[PDB]
Amino acid sequence: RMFKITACVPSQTRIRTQRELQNTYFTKLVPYENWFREQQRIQKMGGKIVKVELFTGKPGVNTGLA
């Protein structure tokens, strides 16, 4: 179960020349196990994901979900 979410991460203002468009808008695939760390990173950025979805069809299996 990997969750794919699109986040317009709030501007970190960390770009002088360089480029910040790729960081500014992100479409990514995140494992459900690692999604908590992704949420923490989104908190540091300041922007919540506009859209959140999970690739796996069913959210919970009590047993052998893997």
Partner 1 sequence: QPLPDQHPYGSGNDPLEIQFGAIFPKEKKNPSARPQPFNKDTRRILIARGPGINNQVSNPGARGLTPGTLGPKVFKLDQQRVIRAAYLQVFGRDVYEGQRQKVAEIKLENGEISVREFVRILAKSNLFRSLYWTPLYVTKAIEYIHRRLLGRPTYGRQEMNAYFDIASKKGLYGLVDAIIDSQEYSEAFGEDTVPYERYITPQGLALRSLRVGTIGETGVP
Partner 2 sequence: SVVTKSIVNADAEARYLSPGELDRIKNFVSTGERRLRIAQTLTENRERIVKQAGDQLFQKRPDVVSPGGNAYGEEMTATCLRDLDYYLRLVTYGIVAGDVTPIEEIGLVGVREMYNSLGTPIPAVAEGIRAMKNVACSLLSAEDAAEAGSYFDFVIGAMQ
Give the footprint of partner 1 on this chain (CB under 8 A): 19, 22, 27-29, 37
Q: Which is nearer to partner 1, 23 or 48 (CB)?
A: 23
Picked from partner 1, partner 2, none, the partner binding residue 19 (CB below 5 to 8 A depending on kind) is partner 1
Taking a C-beta distance cutoff of 8 angstroms, is the pair 9, 46 a contact? yes
- Taken in order 42, 43, 45, 46, the sign of the CA dihedral is positive
Q: Where is 5: in which H helix or E strand?
A: strand 2-7
Q: Is 29 in the site for partner 2 (CB under 8 A)?
A: no
- Binding interface with partner 2 (CB under 8 A): 62-66
